[PDB]
Symmetry: D2
Subunit: 337 residues, 4 copies
């Protein structure tokens, strides 16, 4: 239909999440989950921007207050997430990058959702103030057996919601569900997330490739060929621009926005790549697909891999459909016997 | 202890600049200047993070406060700097990347410093929330004639202070003056820059090379041979990892902290490089040399180039001394006559 | 029952409002309303604290941006409220202090709730930075006739929710519903309201009275007697302390917290007092009563007055039960024939 | 125009203080001091507003960062000031309301100024979110002996600068030095104090009297007669409205802006008044006289009292000159021998 009116639309994430839940006739359990996620992200954003740093540096002579050892944006971000999620009384299992084991939410606080997240992604290089972020994936528990590690082992095809929080020159939460991908910019003055982009679709063909070429020595012939074709185009066309931040969320977001292709392939050292399946690959692949792009491992789609370990790694190539395809053809070409 | 010089306490940019002024027995004109940059950076930072975006999206109606198409972060940032600077009564001429012509300060507000700045660097690419910055270089007006554009045409070697602010996961102002380089962390909560790194010195040798390889088709044989030797080390050592954000302040900063080399050479299809000399090359070079690195154009040193125009471009290479010298060797190996 | 556990309770207003709605099995219309109210308050808080003031004062040389005339925290606060409430698609009628007429929400955006509010209370004296606030009252529309001014004319006994936002040394939103009164402190860094007080009950007897004694000349004998008994106690006990800010929300909150009595009686100039019934008296009376206190006009309870005009005024006395009672007895004593 | 003196631009506290230092040909020691107060106020302001209260309430677990019973805004504020002050290398002795003894600065950080401050004024009453403040007075150490408590015992008349910060609906720093009074508005977004009111002068006569009438039973006949004449004007004029927050900085500030008179006289049950001389009475008096008001104890002028102890109390009356003189008349009318 055609909506005709005197309409002003200042749509916040909270209003959005609630309405969407109303439409779906959910019991509001997921609403509370998402609302809790939004609160965790904001708190992390604030910490990442170093609000309150003056105190570590004794502006008020740290009498003890925050205590002597480290509050590593790394672990702090973890605790903020697990804590905020458990208090939502909506998650039964949590799987985090920082935790060796899947955390089973106390019986008193259990829900029917499983969240796989990466508290602070790209953190290893925070010293140079590179854009870092949070990645999250949510599955609905598919059983009646006591929630165990096993419930997290579901292909990304089974995710009910997924997305990320980019703490770049500004903070953004990109949320993707069955209905589509939407971007929300955080107005830090009022602590609200404003819908700035609705139904985000990725360009069919982009003009930028993203890969850490320092590994060129260990790249497989399919990758080495694609890359060569990006720099020296055989139709004598314009070459692709290159750009690689070293932080997945930042690279993936740049791909979603301007289009192109991101790759973190298998190289001889990490035969199965470096990026972990459950909390990095899946979420980004799911986003990519709802956004209209492709996300493959080179042989198969990422969302269809059935995991066997929560910390399983997996190669990944994602981005505009025409580029991802163009590379996949090369894989088929060099695939033999 | 025989220390007339203490780091157990908390030192803000404002205390720091001021102490440095007392020591230098300045009349206090440069201090009002440095204090104005501090206020400028803080203001642009807040805008970059999107504080207040709610109003633009109609949280109170986009009547005449929102309206449209007028405020472009870059233009705002330009205005803030030019304005906060004139209001210091310390500048006589200002060269801006957003202004075709040099700006001569009204005789009332006229001072003695010449300031060259790039207000919002890397802001073509801001849509994908990439880290951006602001770059500045300050010369002492060395003349007696009515101030003019010519006062801005002094080789980088004559700078009295230079530096930049990086708006990334956090806001940081790196300031380099005659004595050395110092890094101040913005505590957004109190609007104060804290001293976290004193006398920053770059590594002799790093393990990261930064360049836009999308242009590999148009690099000179020296650059080409260099990149090659990094990926495929002849002495069988471990290859150099690659990283490229596409934002000067961000790459330069990564280079300063982790070491390595950043290059933006004379790429065919733009023979004089792309980065501008006065407000991009010179400041980063000044910082670099102050941190113990090198900043070469391939043939000569960046800071010694005599500008012929305020908007002049130049190719540039900077970073750890061992890496920058290594490429220089290759540069000699390939031509002269 | 007895809840026994490993429980951490970081209860935000959003989580609270949602859960309470879940219990009540509401369609979530009121949830969205309350969520929208929370967003309006935060935005007002931010503006009241003068965030961004540097721009009115040309820090970036107001090129036009916010435009030439006034953005009176007074009217701005109004627009923020009406706008945010209409966009919730949950209100059919709004009654504000700043508006002569009851605003009938567009058909496309109607809901079944009526909100009577005071955008910025105590605003007349903002110049001296006195604590100001927002007062709101919510009724459910009791009919099928097209929502008209008439739907706002319901005794305070009919309110479904009521409360206020105090922008004092910190911001607090006191929310009262059928189930009780709760206080939420705003952590401005993350823009969230934290439950800091649960089921707030007022002291039976307080030791502070609040009244503008400058009107002593026009006070009725009942008031004049009570006041005299507060200063010179006939049992030679300790006199009451006095305190009157001149801003209703600030006075009422101090009464709720420490206990005592607040009075804004009828004096010969305003035979029916100054405080308006629908958006000041009712809300505060409702809060007071759920909190365990009393709120009378001197003759009858405020919550039971059936209004005849939306801008009707009404005398008011509220506070601890023992004090309010002690004064009411005096009224009965001097009430004759 | 013949103005070597402009107000069309934006003036921050930092630019202001610094200009004032150049003019006064200061060595720059008092400027580092005033710059330290500025940083101090900003830090306490942020804390007062409760930025970060989430962590205390377990948003990331109250492990050891929260724990308990240690941080009391007043104690924190005390620490911040003492600490930020010592770190200026401009103070030799500090008198604090929270410290039984005067604090002598380590010879390393030792300067020449004596600072008397009340860190969190009106903070017994902070529970009800009443506006609070910080008061400061600065003397030049006029002696040669090893600095001691005695340097703080100088009559108010010897102050070089005095002022206060009010944490109310917004944060304001009012600063009064030899030339006059100036009001700086804190733009919390950029952490900068903006000059909004220059050369503040109080009204000759105002229409508001401020006093705690709960004590009317113990006022001397002069105060009693005065209050009476305000409520029941003998010349049949309109009565004086009353207002009393119970927070010095707040009442004093209301008095400065709207005019009128503030009184806290020698109330039986505390014969020397309640307000302390060094850090409450003297600063407000200094400001007052600088704004064109009067500050009397009833018999003598507050600023001329020679202190005998740093924690000495004194009765005080201040405000518009016509009102303060009027009570003084009544004070003469009632006694001498
Ligand atoms: N925005 C949303 N909020 C809540 N439920 C949603 C939302 N969008 C879709 N739904 C669906 O509602 C289902 C019911 O889950 P629940 O509320 O836990 O009983 C969810 O699992 C989702 O599939
Ligand atoms: N923080 C500082 N403030 C003022 N001048 C300084 C500072 N640090 C070093 N200087 C030197 O002192 C000279 C004095 O210049 P001016 O303040 O205008 O009188 C400057 O040009 C600098 O070379
Ligand atoms: N926190 C709350 N959120 C929503 N509904 C509530 C809440 N507390 C009580 N309820 C009741 O649920 C009723 C249903 O209204 P509605 O959701 O508009 O259909 C409301 O009018 C309230 O009486
Ligand atoms: N903003 C200012 N900074 C420094 N001194 C000032 C200022 N305004 C006035 N003065 C006067 O200058 C004297 C110089 O003291 P000092 O800075 O320590 O050398 C101070 O004691 C004041 O009386
Ligand atoms: O720069 P490299 O060595 O190619 O790997 C960095 C990658 O590792 C991660 O930190 C996590 O696996 C990603 O954010 C990032 O893309
Ligand atoms: O995409 P390109 O052409 O390689 O350019 C990015 C370069 O230009 C700039 O974006 C100029 O703003 C620099 O920050 C950066 O080094
Ligand atoms: O100080 P007065 O004259 O007694 O009246 C002030 C009253 O008016 C109001 O501004 C609104 O009616 C209240 O906030 C306040 O209590
Ligand atoms: O309630 P009282 O005894 O009248 O005192 C309030 C007075 O004491 C103080 O609260 C001291 O902090 C002052 O701010 C104020 O003027």
């Amino acid at each position: 239909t055609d909506q005709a009116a005197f309409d002003t639309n200042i749509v916040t994430l909270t209003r959005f999440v609630m309405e969407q839940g109303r439409k779906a006739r959910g019991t509001g359990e997921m609403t509370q989950l998402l609302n809790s996620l939004c609160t965790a992200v904001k708190a992390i954003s604030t910490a990442v921007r170093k609000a309150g740093i003056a105190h570590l540096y004794g502006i008020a002579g740290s009498t003890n207050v925050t205590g002597d050892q480290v509050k590593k944006l790394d672990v702090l971000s973890n605790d903020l997430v697990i804590n905020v999620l458990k208090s939502s009384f909506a998650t039964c299992v949590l799987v985090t990058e920082e935790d060796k084991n899947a955390i089973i939410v106390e019986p008193e606080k259990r829900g029917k959702y499983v969240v796989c997240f990466d508290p602070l992604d790209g953190s290893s290089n925070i010293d140079c103030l590179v854009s870092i972020g949070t990645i999250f994936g949510i599955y609905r528990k598919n059983s009646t057996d006591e929630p165990s590690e096993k419930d997290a082992l579901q292909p990304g095809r089974n995710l009910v919601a997924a997305g990320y929080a980019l703490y770049g020159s500004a903070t953004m939460l990109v949320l993707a569900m069955v209905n589509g991908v939407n971007c929300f910019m955080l107005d830090p003055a009022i602590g609200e997330f404003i819908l700035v982009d609705r139904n985000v679709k990725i360009k069919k063909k982009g003009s930028i490739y993203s890969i850490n070429e320092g590994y060129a020595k260990e790249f497989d012939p399919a990758i080495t060929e694609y890359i060569q074709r990006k720099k020296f185009p055989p139709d004598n066309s314009a070459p692709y621009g290159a750009a690689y931040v070293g932080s997945m969320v930042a690279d993936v977001h740049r791909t979603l926005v301007y289009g192109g292709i991101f790759m973190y392939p298998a190289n001889k050292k990490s035969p199965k790549g470096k990026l972990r399946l459950l909390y990095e690959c899946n979420p980004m692949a799911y986003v990519m697909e709802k956004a209209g792009g492709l996300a493959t491992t080179g042989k198969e789609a990422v969302l269809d891999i059935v995991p066997t370990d929560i910390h399983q790694r997996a190669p990944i190539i994602l981005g505009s459909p025409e580029d991802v395809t163009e590379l996949l053809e090369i894989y088929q070409k060099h695939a033999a016997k």
